[PDB]
Amino acid sequence: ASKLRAVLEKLKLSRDDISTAAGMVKGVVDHLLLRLKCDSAFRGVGLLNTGSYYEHVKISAPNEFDVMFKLEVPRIQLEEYSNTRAYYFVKFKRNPKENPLSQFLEGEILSASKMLSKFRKIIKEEINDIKDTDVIMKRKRGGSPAVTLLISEKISVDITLALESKSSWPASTQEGLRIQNWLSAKVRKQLRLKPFYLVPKHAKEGNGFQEETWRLSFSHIEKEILNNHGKSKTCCENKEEKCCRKDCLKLMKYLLEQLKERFKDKKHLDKFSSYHVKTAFFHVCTQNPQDSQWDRKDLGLCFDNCVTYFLQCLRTEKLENYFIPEFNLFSSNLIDKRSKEFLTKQIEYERNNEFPVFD
């Protein structure tokens, strides 16, 4: 109640930190975007600002920014890899015109691993010829489609290549985005007329990866929803309509960040990410579609609703991707049962003890 408000106060981003970080990031990102347009493959590349900073749910410090370098790929033909619902091979239809991505084809399949290698290579060469600014590239991770930069040893920038398709969303999405009773059927229809994205994250094949696979991304839609999040079009535009939706997501993010920090050397929580609590939070929005169910005065209850839904997800080992219902973020394949039981026990103790990990 009063204690949660004091936590939200401490999580607020400093105006001075925002001013310095926003300037540093824009300078680096604008430069790379310019250099990439100069390569034959990446002529159409455009910027999408995404994740928690641009959703206004970043907590503590503005020290991690996300951007998509998107690229329209006309006449795309997707093939689902192995019923995984989220991972696809990219092929092309008949096209008289030369394909600008020819260099990355393996037979008829656009190689995610080749395209990412060149993307990463270009960015690497380019961040040397930045001289005015201190910028290094961190080592490639199999988990992330992103190239990660560190600016002035303090600010991380994740850049993901993203193919843009203006086609209908794949069939795996048909029962996703259950926003009809919250944001309206007409908004669901408008969002589903927007493009979708594919990022070069590869699917599991036995011991390793199917290195040519891409994964669906709806980061653009997640941002649209968080920054236009009410049943009322004037939600949070006036003092009579201040909801606690973003406050509840910030508190869930802080709960996980604090537990991950406390066990950062003991492995049990390494497989959990902020995307787990972001996804769970969108599900609680579907369950609680009225702005009256997110009144600022009910912060403690609204936060409890998010905590108990997340606990139910851990116990049942079910957390659907918000866009792709048959994609289980909490499957055995991804997170072993012992890790989920360990997180459940820490979160139960926090809920039973008024969240001492916040104090």
Ligand SMILES: Cc1oncc1/C(O)=C(\C#N)C(=O)Nc1ncc(S(C)(=O)=O)c(-c2cccc(F)c2)n1
């Ligand atoms: C960059 C950027 O800009 N827009 C989206 C975007 C972007 O990151 C993604 C998109 N679209 C995305 O899918 N990222 C991703 N996917 C899986 C994972 S994991 C290893 O499966 O947990 C992670 C991830 C890995 C390590 C640490 C961490 F914190 C997160 N990250």
Ligand SMILES: Nc1ncnc2c1ncn2[C@@H]1O[C@H](COP(=O)(O)OP(=O)(O)OP(=O)(O)O)[C@@H](O)[C@H]1O
């Ligand atoms: N497993 C995932 N599946 C799909 N999209 C993901 C996944 N992980 C991350 N993303 C997308 O990439 C964005 C950036 O991810 P990132 O890990 O930086 O988290 P975030 O939402 O910015 O929150 P924070 O950085 O504060 O933890 C997410 O908001 C989401 O749209």
Ligand SMILES: [Mg+2]
């Ligand atoms: Mg982020």
Ligand SMILES: [Mg+2]
């Ligand atoms: Mg990131």
Ligand SMILES: [Zn+2]
């Ligand atoms: Zn609101």
